[PDB]
Each structure stands twice: as C-alpha cells, then as structure tokens.
C-alpha cells in the first residue's frame, strides 16, 4: 500500500474478542514478513485522533544537514626550507564521505544514493607561536578553491600555472566573508551513488576493493592567494557537505564497531562491550536482572 | 441563612444551609478526555459512583495561633477507599475535584478564612538553597501546615492568592466554601504518586476571636473525584 | 537602489538552513534516473521492520549466542524466565535494533511498539509461555501471579511458531525522551517478562533445552522527532588513509 | 523559495515527499 | 543583482524588534494544542481581579497582621480609622496587588479603581462608616466634615458584608505616570480615608475589636502603556546552583 | 463574556439614584468573585468616549522581548597547564530560564506558558591584561554554538570529534557579524511548559523537586573554533532569549521576596522592609499617616 | 511579513489577539 | 458508605435514606440478625464539626 | 537568496534621510488627538504676520 | 515608502500637508 501519510495512524477502540478460527496474535517469522497484528486486536483500546506528523524522519530532513567532511590545517609562511612533504601555501584533498564517522554512518544506512552536495567551507587563522613569534594580529587573506574533476592536472605549488582556471570552477573569498558556500550536481555516471560496492575498480586483478569507479569525484585544491608575510600563520580550511533532493534505496544495517579505515570496512571493536566484536551490547548480571529497576 | 445547596456526587450528600455560592475554577466543570486529546491508546476504566464521590479527611483545630492547612490533590485522596486502590493498580489517572470545606462557629464568633485551589503549587523552603524533600511535600490525608502564610510558602504573596479559584469563609456570613475544580495539567493524564495538580490551602486571613465560652472549631474537608479515569493498569504498587 | 539593514544571524552558517547556493558547474546535466527496487522516502518505514533483540546480553554469551534465550524443562511451577530492559536511550537488548538505532538519532518517541517471539525447539518440543508488559512505576515483577496483572499475551507452542506481545503506548505525556535517567517519569516505559505458563515437554530424543528469539518493531503509531547525534559512533582520531587522501 | 539560479539542482531542499511504501519490507511475501 | 543601500540600525540588535529568524530544527512537529483551563491573552484581566491592601503596614505588624485593619469602640464621634496612600508608583498599600504589581511593569496609567472592604466581625456587631476618596491638590483630610466633600460611601454593616468605593478616573492630563515624586501633579491621585459615620456597638460575648480587609482592582476603563522592567526584582549576585549549570 | 476588546470601555452618563432593593455598592467577597459595582452606580458621571487602546497589555507583547538568559566569561589561550575546571576556549550550558531575574519573574506570572524561543549570541573580546601583556588588538575569531538535546553526547575538548555535529544544529559566527539569531520551536513534550511544577522528575523518591522532566531542553556548547594563539585574550558569550508566538493559562501571584537559587523556590527575604519576610511592604508611622502628604 | 522560510514558527511575534474573557477570573461563580 | 453530611440551619431536620441494596429480592425476619437474608447493615452518626 | 550589491552612500547617515526605523516601543498607542486652537501647517503663515 | 513594520509611527516623514488657513494669525477678528 503506496499512500501519503503525513501523521501517524489513529487508533480505533476495540471490544472483547473470543472467535474460532482468528489468532491474530500468532505469526510466522518464517516467510520473511513482520508481525501484522494490531493494538487493537492485542488489547482493548479506545479511539484515539492521532495528530503527530512524521515530517522530521523524512529521508530529506534526516540527511539534509550540513556535516564536516574535510579539516586541513597547513602552515602559510615562506616555504623555501621546508621538505618536500608539508603543505606549501596550499593543499589538495581526494574528495570522500568516509573520513569523519557521523556522516559515514548516516550515509551507510542505505545501500544507493542520489543528491546534490551544497559544499560550506570554512577558514579560520592563528598566529604562529613557534620560536619567539608574537601575536601580531590576524591579516584578511583571500583563498582559491578549485574543484579539478578526474583527468585534470592538480597545482603542484601555491603559484603555479593551474591556478589561472580556464575551465575548472574555482571560488575565490575572504577569511573575513561568510564561508564560501556552492552546489555541486549529482555528478554519478549512473542513476545513483553506490554507499557500497561489492567489486573491484579496475579490469585486472589488483584494483581496489569497494570503491566504485563509478562514484569517483575528483580533486579539491585549496590555495592562500596572498604572497607569504614576514611572519608565518596556520591556516585551517574546514569543508562542510549538506545532501539535498535525495533519493534513498536499500536500507542497510548500522554498523556497530568503530570504524577502521576509510578505504574498507575493516572491523576490530572495542576491547569490552559495548559495540566490541564478542558483545555489541553491554552485559547484566544475567536474562533475569533489570540495572535500572525502580526500588521503594 | 444566606444560601442553601446540595451535593449529591454518587453515594454521598451534602447539605449547606448557610452559604455564599460555589466556584467553578475558571468557569470550566469537569469532563472525560475526548478522543482528539487523548494520548494512551489503551481502554479506560471509569469507575464513576466508586470513585466519584465525596471523600472527608480528618478535621484540623481552629486555633488562635493557626498560620493555615495544606492538602496536595490526588496526594490526599491516594489510599482512600476505590480511588486509591484504582490509584494504586493505573498508571495513569485523570480527575477534577468538588471541594467543600465547612467550618460553623455562633454569632458571636469571628473570622475569616480565605480557601484557595492553587494550581502547580510548586513549594519552597525558607532559609536553605536545598530544596524541599519528598517528607516535606507529601503528607498524605493529614496534610500540612504554612510555615510562613505571608508569602504562601513559595517566596510570592498571599495578598495575590485571589488571583486563583478562591471561596472565603466570613463566620459572621456563611459556615462552607465549595470549589469545583477541571482537571489542570500540561498532560492530558498524569501519574498520580509523583505529582500533584492542585493544592487546597485554607489560611486564617482574620483569625478567630469571641468573647464566649469558648469550644473547639475544626475545619473539615470533603472532597469528592470528578470523572475519574485511569489507564495502565498492573499489580498494585502503593 | 533599495534600501536595506541587516538583520542579527547576517552572515552566520547555521548547518540546518535550507537556502538554494550558486550551481558550480552550469548547463551540466545529470545521468536520467532509472528505477531502483527498494527505495525509502521516510525513517519510520525502517523502525517498522523487525529485528533481532539481544535479549542474551550476559557475560558467557559470545557472538550469536547473545540473539537466542534458552528455555529448558523446570521442576517447579510459575517460575520466571527472562526479562527484557524496555530503555531504548540506555544500552541494552533494544539498543542495536532497526527501531532502536534509528530512534537514538532522535530525541522524543511516541507511539506503540510490537515485540515478536520465535521459537526454535523441534517439532514435538511443546510449551505454554506467558509474555507480560507492565507500565512503569513500580519494581519488575518477579512472580507469575504480580506479572499476569499487566497487559500480557498466552502463547502456545504450535504450527505457527511466533507470537506477538503489543507494547501499547500508555504515556502520560504525549512523548517520551532519552534522558539517560531511566528512572525519569519521562523516559521510564515499564518492564517486560515471561514466565511458564506452562512447562516444556519433549521426547526423550528432542533436545531438553529449545530457543527462543526476539524481535522487536515499531507500529504505525511510531513517530519521532528533535534529531540529534547519535551516540553510537564515535571518533578518538583520523581514520587510516584519511591523511592519505592529502598526500 | 527564491531560487533565482539557472540550474535547477540549485534550488533548496524538497522536503514534501510524504509518500511512502512500507509493505515492501515489511511483507515483501507474494 | 538588485542594487542596494545599508540604512543606519543595520546589524544592531535591538532587543524589542518583531523579525523571524532560521528554524534551528526543520520539519519539527511541535505537540498538538490541548485545553488548559484558564488562558490569559491581555495582561488588563489579571489586574482586574482585586486582591488584599496591605494598609496595615507598620512596625508591630508581623506577616499576615499587616492584610487586615482592626477597628474598635469610640467614645468620640466624627474619627479617623485609618487612611490609604493611593501612590502605586512608591512603596505603600497598593504596591504588592495584582493592579499594583502588574502596573509597576508599565510607566504610564489610565482608568479608574475600585476599592473593596470587608467587615469581619461577628454576626451581630453592628457600625456605619464612610469611605471618601480626595483628588489632589491639598492635604489629606483629618476629620470628617473635610472627608465627606469629596468622593464617598457610607457603608452600613448587614447580610453583605462588602462595600466598594470607586476611586473614579479624574484627571487632568489623558494619562498619569510613574513618577519617584509622589506631590507630581502628573502622578499624584488624591487620597482615601476612613471614618466613623457610627460606632462599632457589640454585645458581651462579641470579641470588642472586629476586623475590616481591604481589596483592589481595576475596572474596564483601565489602561497601561510604556513597559518597563519592574523595580520589584533585582539581583546582587548569581543566584545559588546558577553556575553549576556550566559543570 | 468573551469578546474582542481593542479599546477602554466607555462611560455613561448616570442620573440620582433612590430605589429600594438596589444595592450596586454592596458586595459578597465571600463568593470569591470580585466587586461588580459600576462608576455610574457609585458616582454621578458624563459620557466619555474612550479611546485608550489596550495592545500594550497583550501577554504577546507583554512577554515578547529579549532578554539575557546567559552569560558566561571563559579565557580564549593555550590550556595546556590550566587545571581540569575552567573552560578550555569552550563551555557547555544547560539551558535554563531561571538564572537571571527579570525574565524569570515575568515567566513565572503564569502556571503554563507555550511558545517558540528566539534565541540571539552576542560575543565580546577582550585582551587579557594578566601579567605583563598588552593590548596588541581584538582578533575577529570565528565561534561554533551547538544545541545538543538530551541524550547526546556533549564535547569534552575544543576539538573533540563531537563538533563535527552530523545531526546537531550548530551556527558559526564571527565577532565582527551582528548577533548570530536563531528560533527553536515549542520542544516540550506536553502542550505547554510547566512554569511551575507540583511533583518529582524520577519514580523513585530521590528525584528532583520542581522541575518537570518534561520541560528539559538540553545543553548549549559554545565553542572557539580558531586554535589558540601566542597571546591569552578573554571572550564573553552572552545569550538572549525572545518568546513569541505565546500562550499563557493561570496566572500566579507575582514573586516578592528575592530569589535564591535557580533549582527552587526557596525564600528568606531581606533584612528589613521592603521585600521582608515579616514586612513586603515599607513601614509608616501609623495607619492614619501619609509620608507624601502635600501641605502647604 | 516577509517569513521566507520554511517552518512556520519561524515567524515573527503574533501580536493580534485582542479577545478576552476576564470573568473566568473575577466571576467564576455558577 | 451512604452518607450525608447535615449542617444545622433554618431547616431542623435532615433525611438519610437507607435504600433498598439487597442480593436477594426480599427479606426475612429471622431472629438471627446475623443472617444474609436478615441483615440490613449499620446506621452510624459523627462529628462532621 | 537575493543576489545584490551595495552602492555608494551605503551605510552612511545623512541627516535629511527620510526612512523608516525600528518602533522601539511596539504597540505603544499614543494619546488620542485633541483639538487646540492655532495649528500650523506651512511656516509661510507665519511670515503673512506683520 | 517601504515600512515593513508593524507599528505605524515607524513610517517616514509625511510630507503631503498643503492645506493651510493663515487668517487664524492675519485676520483673527470676527
Ligand atoms: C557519496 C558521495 C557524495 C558525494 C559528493 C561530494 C562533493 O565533493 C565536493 C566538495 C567537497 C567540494 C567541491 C568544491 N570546492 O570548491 C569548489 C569550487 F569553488 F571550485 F567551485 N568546488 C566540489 C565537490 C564535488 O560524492 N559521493
Ligand atoms: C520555560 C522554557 C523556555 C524554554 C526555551 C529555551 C531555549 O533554549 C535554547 C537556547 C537558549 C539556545 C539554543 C541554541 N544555541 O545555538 C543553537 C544552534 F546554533 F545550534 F542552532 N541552538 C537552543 C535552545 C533550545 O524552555 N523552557
């Protein structure tokens, strides 16, 4: 029965039942389906107009809210002595759900998705402590993020030439604006997003494992434009997702035990319950002990 | 005389011979929930002449140095005939209250006592941040007394307490005060051991005087259950 | 030009508005939609579904052996099985559940519950079991006699092989909360019980001791509302291969 | 609301999808 | 885009302005509405109900003493039994009333006054006095014959034991103020006093002392404007467990 | 009578009264029923056309204007040696309306209240002076406020994976934006709040008294989201709350002895009148005295 | 006046109820 | 039980009335007033004040 | 949203501006209007006087 | 002009009052 329920079902008074042939209370977990007996067939109820709407538990309302899926924080100095192994003015960023673990997990409660992203990001700076350095002050910087799609070639330093942005989007705002805010499409070569992929990415026998080739978004590049000062700062850029217009389909199993990784859905749990491999629930003295029994 | 009524409430009756009127508490009488407010959907009892009917508690002692009496609705019904073992074995219950303080003195005796249903009347303590105990607020039948009438006992004013279902009781006018009170709550049913909706205080504004031989005054309290409902019912739990 | 003023919350990123932001890539068109097999337009088509209740949530219980309670042949009469802890909002046999889980991403519940019980003795294993709910505000009941006083269900062992106990909604208030105060007038939902009604018999060749399984659902009353975090996921540091998405 | 872009992915949230089948995992039976 | 300009008073805050912010939680269900017994929707009801004068409010007097004014036998005719500042704006009889608290919230006021007494006494102690009411401009009158010419009842003690004098609205100006100046012809309302029209005579066995209890309301034609924060709460300091709320 | 009253009534002119079983004057306040006594049956009056509004009075305008309901001082610095009590550039609040005066004095002239809040954050800076240090200047930090309802979790760091608030409304703000502002709706689980409640929070008899489990909104947690920097700076986050949209039932006696504490109503007055506990109102000489008698 | 927003107790102040009924508190006698 | 509650006044007198609660259709006298076919039950007064 | 732009003279306060501001006191009602004799409502009346 | 405002005083200046009577000042005789 497909329907438009904007409230819960109202219940209807019911008197004493005593009739042969008519359990019912009696199921068959066996075929697969829930219990269909109803509160009133169970107990005498009375008429009750229910007016409890069920619009907040909407597939909509329950993944459009905005959830850090990035935080990078790099240090905007003079570079000239650093390895070859910090951010240099600037940093890129594999674009993935899978590394901060409440969307993860709100996401992973279905087996295929489809939304626009609306992509917040962020920026805060301090003043750099090391050595004897001083307070100083704050300075209102202006930082480039560019979205280079899969294929295209990504900065390699916080001047070079890639950053001239004939194609690529790329938003340019102030520490001091409102963080940067913009929409990026449903950008799936197929119908949906695979949350899982039972397969393997490439033709051969050495490609990665659920990740589908399919899902993949590309690259985001973040640069401080302003040349570096006579004093060094660190830089935090934070990156915000927020679903809208989502379809769901499949709902899955929450995942119980932390997560691991996020290439795999690799499980250890906790040393003791709760949520450890053994015991997901946390233990009582036996089947027949209540922690929180009301005494008087 | 200067008013007569009656007051039938099942098995029981009252008769008052000298009255001022009776007060509906905001001009509402009681009645059954309705089913576009109703909340559990599980059958009610409503026992009705069991319940519904006028229960007197015992009398208190009209006295000179008398600072008032207090009594926590259902507090002081639970454990009292059908309503308290309905109380009891539910979960949930629903009333109002038909309240009738009588109090007779002669014609050469003075005072006056102000009866007033307070709703949600949340009690403080006097010189202490510790908040009041669970002794402290239920009683039971026997009540309790004000401790400083002045300010009700919660930091606010007795000269304000008119602002709610009051009656008075003026010896040199009449000898009873009835109160009809609806079921007050932010709930459509409540747990009847761990709250109490209405507080009946009775507070010797004028206090008693006479020139006579003097006899004892007491005070008596009858209140009788109004559309009593009661959901969630399992062992009895006192 | 207009005139204007700004108003306070000008400028501030509240992560529940819903605005419509400039299209990054314009005229780009998405892939047409194809029909997919199960899709899910509200939360409490999930709840509804019934899951397994870890009823068995004791030391010496390992794995799976936590999703079945042991019912064995007894020597005395009315004696007492095994109860079920009612606080979804606290950790216990209801918490890893479809209802449960997606209920702790909630802050108030209304609305009737089912609880299902499978048995899975052999077929001339018999037994008569009573299921009792009873709402709060006293002890769980430990005696057949307290326990029959509250709303329960008789249940004979037979072709069907399940029963249904209803867990209705008898609330004083028109929700309820996860308080983490279990015994708070606002979160407390009562105790479930079963005891023998009857005994378990079985033939000398039938195993002597059978099992049972729980699974709980919510019923179209269900409803919920104030999301909030779930605290089931948590994260003490970067997950592997995070910083290598920098790198 | 407003909505004054070209695209039309761009527009806000549509939460007024109150159309549902539980049935089909419920008793997803014949 | 559309061209625009900021107007002075953007970006400030000022606390009485009617706007509508962002819903925090979207697509809540607040709960339904139900009946609760005794709604108020304008503040002018609640100062419409009379409540007790406090015009015994003199040392000696302790609690519940200082709501009622005794009044006995006199061997002299024509005297004063007590009087009754009108000032609301300052300490004195009619501050802690409903009219009076309420009022203290606004700084301008309107309308007209009734002023209740009851007699308490026993039911056959008998006496007549008389109640007047004075507009400003001169001193409060001390004896009878001045008292009679302004505003007046006399009351004859019987079956109802309640008078009322009305304190009608005669001014000057459309409103009246608060004002910390009490002789302010913007603020000042006159006077009430109480005399003996009669005696109070009671038998032997009547208490020789009886007791009157003095009420006050507003009527219809009351009227407040210019809220303002009550000079009847104020704060030293952070009030005990205020800061345990951030532990 | 229930009508609709925008205006005071109007008086009517009135002529000499003598008849005989009329007795407008006199009353029964035994009745419980306030004087019913016009002033055309006291007084001789004339016809006046009242025009005096009565909009003022509204319980809406009466209760809708914010005012504070928090305000907490926590030092914004490196917290690597302070002790495990003070606010580590964060803080946690559980909502309550009963901390500052005036707001709760006019709230609790009702029995039941129901409406949505308007919630505003006004922030303030100041350069710490402890020391040795100077004024160096006012850094334009960016702030996080999280609502996080009853049963979630609450951080325990200023960058604890809490903030990443999947689920939980969060605003950011910065000091150099207006206020941030904005509303919760009505959230208690019955139809209106319990300004006052007869009763215990728990089934047991160990519960708090006074507060209506019903009415518990959750916890507020302001956060710096800027890492700390060389200098140690002092912020200031106050909260206001507005009421709108307001339905009042059963007003209660205005509160005259000072409050004491915010978890009860308990009371000890002030050591002499007014406001005493033995005298609310100042004392006279005598009961045939005015202290502000004109004479002349 | 304006409330572009979605949920309706986003909007502002609802300052327009101007009916009363007094005597529930000062006759509320039969 | 059956009750009323009798406050002195103008009128001197007051009525209870005892109705007819009986299991059986009539009653008997017996000589055993401990009977059920006999017993009727009690009629007590108190103090209300 | 709206998008939009400032332009010059935004933000700035000339003293013969002619907007509407913020009712600080809302619902207030003023005092009903009153007859008095001599209104003026052009200043050139004024000047008509010798 | 605009006045998005709910109390009337709020609106901007009123500028539109071309009526006038100068011989209450210049011919105040009967
Ligand atoms: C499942 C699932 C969900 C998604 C969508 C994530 C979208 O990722 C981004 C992010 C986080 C930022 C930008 C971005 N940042 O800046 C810019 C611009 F300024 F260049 F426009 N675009 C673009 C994409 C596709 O993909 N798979
Ligand atoms: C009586 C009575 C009145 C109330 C309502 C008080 C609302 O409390 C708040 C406050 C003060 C702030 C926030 C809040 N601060 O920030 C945020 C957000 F930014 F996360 F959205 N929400 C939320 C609530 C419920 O509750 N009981």
Redesign the interface.
């Known amino acids: 029965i497909e329907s438009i ?1 904007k409230t ?2 109202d ?1 209807v008074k019911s008197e004493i039942n005593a009739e042969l042939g008519v ?1 019912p ?6 075929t697969g389906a ?2 269909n ?3 009133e067939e ?2 005498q ?1 009375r008429t009750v107009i ?1 007016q ?3 619009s ?4 909509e ?2 993944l ?4 850090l899926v990035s935080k ?1 924080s790099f240090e905007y100095k003079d570079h000239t002595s650093s390895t070859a192994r910090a ?1 240099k003015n600037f ?4 674009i ?1 759900t ?5 969307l993860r ?2 996401l992973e ?4 998705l ?1 939304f626009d992203a ?3 990001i ?1 920026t805060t700076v301090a003043v750099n402590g090391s050595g004897n350095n001083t307070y100083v002050g704050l300075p209102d910087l202006t930082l480039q993020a560019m ?1 280079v799609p899969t294929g295209a070639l990504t900065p390699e330093k916080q001047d070079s030439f890639h950053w001239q942005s004939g194609s690529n ?1 790329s ?1 340019f705002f102030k520490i001091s604006d ?2 940067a ?12 997003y695979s949350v899982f992929y039972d397969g393997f990415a490439g033709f051969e026998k050495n490609g990665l494992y659920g990740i589908n080739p399919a899902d993949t978004i590309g690259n985001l590049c973040v640069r401080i434009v302003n040349e570096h000062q006579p004093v060094g700062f660190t830089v935090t850029v934070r990156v ?1 997702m ?1 679903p809208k217009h989502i ?5 899955r ?4 035990l ?6 795999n859905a690799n499980y250890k749990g906790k040393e003791r ?3 450890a491999l ?19 | 005389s200067d008013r007569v009524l009656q007051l039938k409430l099942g098995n029981s009756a009252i008769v008052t011979q000298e009255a001022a009127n009776y007060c509906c508490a905001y001009g509402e009488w009681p009645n059954y929930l309705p089913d576009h407010e109703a ?4 059958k009610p009892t409503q026992p009705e002449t069991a319940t519904d009917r006028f229960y007197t508690l015992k009398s208190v002692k009209w006295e000179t140095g008398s600072t008032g009496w207090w009594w926590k609705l259902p507090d002081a019904l639970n454990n009292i005939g059908m309503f308290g073992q309905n109380v009891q ?1 539910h ?2 219950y629903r009333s109002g209250f038909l309240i009738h303080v009588q109090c007779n003195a002669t014609k050469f005796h003075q005072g006056a006592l102000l009866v007033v249903a307070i709703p949600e009347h949340q009690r403080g303590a006097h010189n202490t941040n510790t908040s009041p105990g669970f002794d402290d607020i239920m009683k039971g039948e026997e009540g309790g007394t004000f401790n400083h009438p002045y300010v009700l006992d919660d930091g606010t004013s007795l000269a304000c307490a008119t602002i709610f279902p009051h009656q008075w009781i003026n010896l040199r006018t009449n000898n009873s005060a009835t109160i009809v009170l609806p079921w007050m709550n932010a ?5 009847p ?3 109490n909706q209405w507080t009946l205080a009775i507070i010797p504004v004028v206090p008693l005087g006479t020139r006579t031989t003097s006899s004892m005054v007491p005070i008596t309290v009858s209140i009788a259950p109004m559309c009593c409902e009661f ?5 009895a ?1 006192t | ?28 068109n ?5 029909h ?11 709840v ?3 899951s397994m209740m ?6 010496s ?3 799976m052996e ?1 999703l079945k ?1 042991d019912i064995s042949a007894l020597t005395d009469v009315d004696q ?4 079920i ?1 009612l ?1 979804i ?5 209801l ?2 559940t ?1 209802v449960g ?2 209920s ?5 519940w ?3 519950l ?1 609880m ?1 019980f ?1 048995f899975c003795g052999s077929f001339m294993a018999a037994g008569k079991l009573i299921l009792c709910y ?8 430990t005696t057949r006699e ?2 029959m ?3 329960h ?1 008789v249940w004979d062992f ?1 072709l ?7 867990i ?21 939902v ?2 479930v019980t079963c005891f023998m009604q009857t005994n378990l018999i079985v033939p000398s060749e039938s195993s002597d001791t059978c099992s049972l ?1 729980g ?1 709980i ?1 919510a ?18 540091d ?5 910083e290598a ?2 790198q | ?3 004054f ?3 039309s ?5 549509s ?1 007024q ?6 049935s ?3 008793e997803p039976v014949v």
């Open positions: 329920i819960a079902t219940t359990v209370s009696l199921n068959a977990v066996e829930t219990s007996t109803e509160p169970a107990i109820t229910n409890h709407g069920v907040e538990t909407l597939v309302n329950f459009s809210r905005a959830a990078r951010d940093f890129k960023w594999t993935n899978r590394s901060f673990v409440q997990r709100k409660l279905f087996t295929y489809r609306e992509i917040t962020l979205f989007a938003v409102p963080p805010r913009i929409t990026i499409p449903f950008m799936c070569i197929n119908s949906a915000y927020k379809k769901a389909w499949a709902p199993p929450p995942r119980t932390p997560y691991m990784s996020i290439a319950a709760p949520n053994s015991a997901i629930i946390g233990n009582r003295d036996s089947v027949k002990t209540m922690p929180h029994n009301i005494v008087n | 909340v559990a959907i599980d074995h979960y949930l709930a459509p049913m409540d747990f051991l761990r709250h959901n969630g019912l399992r062992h739990i | 030009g207009v005139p204007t003023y700004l108003l306070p919350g000008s400028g501030q990123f509240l992560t529940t508005d819903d605005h419509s932001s400039a299209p990054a890539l314009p005229c780009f998405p892939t047409p939609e194809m997919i097999p199960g899709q899910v337009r509200n939360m409490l088509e999930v509804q579904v019934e870890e009823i068995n949530n004791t030391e219980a390992v794995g936590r309670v007492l099985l095994f109860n802890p606080d909002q606290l950790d216990g046999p918490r890893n479809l889980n997606i702790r991403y909630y802050t108030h209304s609305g009737s089912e299902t499978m009873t709402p709060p505000g006293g002890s769980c009941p307290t326990a006083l509250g709303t269900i037979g069907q092989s399940s029963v249904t106990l209803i209705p909604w008898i609330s004083g208030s028109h929700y309820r909360m996860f308080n983490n105060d279990a015994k708070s007038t606002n979160a407390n009562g105790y399984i699974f659902a019923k179209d009353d269900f409803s919920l509302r104030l999301m909030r975090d779930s605290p089931d996921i948590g994260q003490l970067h997950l592997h291969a995070a998405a920098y | 609301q407003i909505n872009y070209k695209d992915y761009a527009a806000s949230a939460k999808d109150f159309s549902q089948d539980p089909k995992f419920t």
